[PDB]
C-alpha cells in the first residue's frame, strides 16, 4: 500500500485548501517544497487551523522537526503519530481520510 500522505510538489495554497476540509485533528500531508527545492514540508490541520512545518536536515543527513532526528521521512512521520509536531499544541499526526 503506497503511503496516503505523500503529495509530491503541490503548492502550499493547495495543501491548505485540501486540509481545511478534513474533519479530524492531525490530518496531514508531506509535500516537496516549491519555495525551497530539495526540501520537504509538513502541513497539518489542528482545530480549524492549518499549519506548516519545514522538514529540517542536519550535518549528518538526518530529518527532524525540532530535536529528535530520523533517517527517513517515513520514520519521522510514524514517530509523530504519538509525539506532538508542535511545542505549544498537542498535535498528533493522523492520516487523511480519502
Amino acid at each position: 500500500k503506497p503511503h496516503p500522505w505523500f503529495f509530491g510538489k503541490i503548492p502550499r495554497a493547495k495543501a491548505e485548501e485540501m486540509l481545511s476540509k478534513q474533519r479530524h485533528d492531525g490530518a496531514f500531508l508531506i509535500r516537496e517544497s516549491e519555495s525551497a527545492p530539495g526540501d520537504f514540508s509538513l502541513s497539518v490541520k489542528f482545530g480549524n487551523d492549518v499549519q506548516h512545518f519545514k522538514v529540517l536536515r542536519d550535518g549528518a543527513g538526518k530529518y527532524f522537526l525540532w530535536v529528535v532526528k530520523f533517517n527517513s521521512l517515513n520514520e519521522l512521520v510514524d514517530y509523530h503519530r504519538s509525539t506532538s509536531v508542535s511545542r505549544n499544541q498537542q498535535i498528533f499526526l493522523r492520516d487523511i481520510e480519502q
Binding site: 502550499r12 519555495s35 514540508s41 499549519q51 506548516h52 512545518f53 519545514k54 529540517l56 522537526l65 525540532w66 508542535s86
Partner: peptide
C-alpha cells in the same frame, strides 16, 4: 517569504 511553525525569522 513563507513561514513555518518550526522556523524562526
Amino acid at each position: 517569504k513563507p513561514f513555518y511553525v518550526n522556523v524562526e525569522f
